[PDB]
Amino acid sequence: VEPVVVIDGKGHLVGRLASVVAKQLLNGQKIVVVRAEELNISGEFFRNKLKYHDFLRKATAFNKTRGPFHFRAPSRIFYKALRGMVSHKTARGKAALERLKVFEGIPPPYDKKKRVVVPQALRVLRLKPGRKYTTLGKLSTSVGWKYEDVVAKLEAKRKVSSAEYYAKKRAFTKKVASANATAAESDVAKQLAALGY
Amino acid sequence: GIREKKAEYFAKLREYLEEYKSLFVVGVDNVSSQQMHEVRKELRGRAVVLMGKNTMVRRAIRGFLSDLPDFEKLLPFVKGNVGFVFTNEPLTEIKNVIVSNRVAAGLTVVQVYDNGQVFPSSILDITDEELVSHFVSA
Amino acid sequence: MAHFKEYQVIGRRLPTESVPEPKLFRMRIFASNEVIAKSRYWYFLQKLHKVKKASGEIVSINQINEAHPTKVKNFGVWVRYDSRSGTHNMYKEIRDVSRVAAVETLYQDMAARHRARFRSIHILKVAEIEKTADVKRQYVKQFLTKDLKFPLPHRVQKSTKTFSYKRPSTFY
Amino acid sequence: STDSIVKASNWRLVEVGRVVLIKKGQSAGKLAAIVEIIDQKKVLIDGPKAGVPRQAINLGQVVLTPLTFALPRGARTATVSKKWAAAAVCEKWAASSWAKKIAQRERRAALTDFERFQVMVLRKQKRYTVKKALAKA
Amino acid sequence: MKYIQTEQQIEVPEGVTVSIKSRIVKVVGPRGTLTKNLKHIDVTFTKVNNQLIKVAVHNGGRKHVAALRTVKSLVDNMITGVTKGYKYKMRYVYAHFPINVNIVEKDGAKFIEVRNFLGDKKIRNVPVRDGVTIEFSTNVKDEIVLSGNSVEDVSQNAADLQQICRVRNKDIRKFLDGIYVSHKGFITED
Amino acid sequence: IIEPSLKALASKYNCDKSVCRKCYARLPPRATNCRKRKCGHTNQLRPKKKLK
RNA sequence: AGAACUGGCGAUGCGGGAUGAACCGAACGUAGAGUUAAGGUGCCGGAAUACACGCUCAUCAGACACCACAAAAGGUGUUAGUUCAUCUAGACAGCCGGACGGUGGCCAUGGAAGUCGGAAUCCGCUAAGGAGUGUGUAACAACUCACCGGCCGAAUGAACUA
RNA sequence: GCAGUCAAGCGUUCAUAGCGACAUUGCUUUUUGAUUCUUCGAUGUCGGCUCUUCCUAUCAUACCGAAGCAGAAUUCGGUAA
Fold first, then answer.
1. Which CATH class is domain C70-146?
2. Which residue is nearest nucleotide G125, judged by alpha carbon to C1' distance?
3. Could you tell me the residue range of the domain that residue A97 belongs to?
4. Span C3-69: which CATH code?
5. Which N-terminal stretch is annotated as signal sequence (chain F)?
6. What's the CA C93/C1' H57 distance, rounded, in angstroms?
7. DSSP string spanning D60-97?
8. F48 CB contact with strand H at below 7 Å
């Protein structure tokens, strides 16, 4: 229904997301993701950490460099969690991934554009109150990542550039809600009410 | 046994509800053991006081509806640390020795019950000047 | 193991010249179909008397409608059943509207709290009570209070589509 | 100030006399009202003025309303429509914005192309007012 | 059995205020203020009046229930803190080596200091947090006291001082040296 | 030199305790189960040996 | 390793069990269409992030037969149940009122009035009382229990099981 | 080979600090066997030397708990390769 879909991971889960992401990419629906650093995962920080550690050691015994690349950036966590939900040695699986890009936060050419949410994959709906979850940015840096401060820094920048835009827009609509109601009570409008408008 | 002991209490209750034509429901709140005991020796003349569980009291008085039907109105006054001073002497005498003498204020008289009649204890202390205004003005 | 029905089932040992007019036996049985209600009849009649499927006959097989299927009712259930290590009995209660769903709820409970299946479980007795305060559990008494109220928070909007355009709410 | 402060999420409660809204089944979009409560999620409702039968259901397909009226418990269906229209609750529900959108999207469905191209050009003849309106101001 | 509803009641005394929004508690009184976070519980409050508050949970488990009782204590603690203050008394001990104790500032850091614990060379350092105040005793011997409104920081900084003066490589049953809590009370009610 | 009051004050923190036969933790003297998982919140406990 | 009945592999593909000679299903000319099996429906992957009742949080979760493993004995982790007991004649638990007199019961002494310690366990009014379960003074004064009674009003423990 | 359970009993008094009879449940494949499925038109069938890695049922080092631990010395145990 759209050419491109920007998706915020904030409040999301990695598993439930990438599934509904994967089957969209193989159908051509171009995706792109933001605020990957702020994903959530069930279980406490410790289990979601150790499970990385058990994977962290798993390595080609005789030459570590051709073994499992253990990326730590939350981007390439969600990526891997996506790739593993794909037959990714075929070309179908490859073009599926040029259809996708994942970022931390929200770079310029995507920040002034809408981004969305996936109700199937929400902590706040899918996951019960009273269970421990785990942010990813706490973890990626706990296993090699660096730039948690940078994103929190570069993020707070735009959010100021955002709030400008919002309240600049907010009053601009209350302007509309005024100059429209003078026409709301018009015979033109009374017809539209007769037709569902 | 234990319930028979609750029953042992009920006996003296009914014993004095009937053995005495009157009973002064007196407030045993704040009455010390030396104060309740000194209530006896002065009451050893006529009155006998009987203490227990108010729940046992009402549950005792709740069982005397076949005969002694007028005892139904003792239950609303079985409240707080209050108890009956079963007695047969005139009103002002036991009323004064209960409330005035050997009082640490301290027990008052919650209610004076006799022959299905209820008194607020206020006019009971009327010594004089009440009948003169009624007999003269009438 | 379905949406159940309560059947009344009557059978007797097969008559002969020896005993015309045998002694019928009624049972209030729970299942999906009248077929099974004949089966478990013989399953129990065995245990109680010297008979079988073959020396016996059904005299009648009827479904029971519920007498008052909107009257919410506190149902008390004596029960027997079996475990991995032996046989057990119970008395357990539900507040619900029919004897039927009161059991359709039961087997699911038993199949999660003690891991029993229809084959292991026997039902013994099912009773409405005339007066409150005859109850013995608490999660039932939780609902018998005057002027009772309570909320249902964390309303969730199971979406039709996949995507959205709003971090939703749950105020309800 | 000396007065303490608490904000409490005003939630829709469950109770007798609570009106509901059914979402699935033969009663999609209909209204009903509880007579009794069973468990955390099961109930005894009725929709006589609407024609929904006294029954039971989960609270899953049912969404609660901001509306409510006074009602004795367990009161059979005759009492319901009585206490119901005694309060005139559909109209309250009708005056609600909630109901008004349902009737909107429905009319949007039942439309016809000539009505759509009627709508379309109408908005424009409307909308031209708004510009020369919403430029001076 | 999934308790449908359980509640606990809190009292707020006079001259006191309390302000809740998004389960972010503030608590203000004569000592000053107290602020708190409790987003890690999914529970409800209610102001029935400026003099009493209810906390309750609707249709919750058992481990979601106990958290109703504890939250009663915290605001009961914070209330009592900013009103009565909190006060935690210690007592040095030594059978041979007299402990030295001081308070020192590195850029106002207000570090507690310790020396001669069993005559050791090592100097120890415990910081003094905010909201806590210190007083050595004079009417009585070696009864340093800490006090404040935040029982958390206090009993923490207390126990921070207890575990730091712990024995190594010995039988503590004999070597009872250290810095132990004796009594803990308020600033008010004597 | 060192007095029983401070001693008993020390006993509450250093001796008046209890221990598990397995989890070997220094536990409250009134406790009934161990506060450790690896042993399994067991109930085999003892009092710490009062010195001499 | 060796026997019995029957069925299969060898001699036989096919769908599934990821893989797998014997398991489940089913046996086959070449094609098309329809329905089903056994198995399954988050993605890999075709199919319901379908509905519904419940249990589970694991600092080492578990996740379907043949099958690629686990036991003893334990757990105030959690749920359900059983058996026994206290309590509306008012219990528990929490709070509250007396904690009296013969009476500071007898020895121990600078002083020990129910509480360092040695020896008796009795009596009155009693709803009740231990000749006291315990705090504090140099010793009184000044309290909480035993026991009993005013408060809400009905829950609470013990051993068991799965 | 290795680790558990129970507790008669030692451990001056005490079953369990350390010990642990009478029994009992199990693990590992570094012992030896058992069987012979591969391989007899083919696996170069002891040991040492050099060299890397891996496990833990840890011998030392780091942090800790308990003791029939006064200190020193030791013993039991825990995390940990």
1. alpha beta
2. B37
3. 1-147
4. 3.10.20.10
5. none
6. 53
7. SSEEE-S------TT--HHHHHHHHHHH-HHHHHHHSH
8. yes
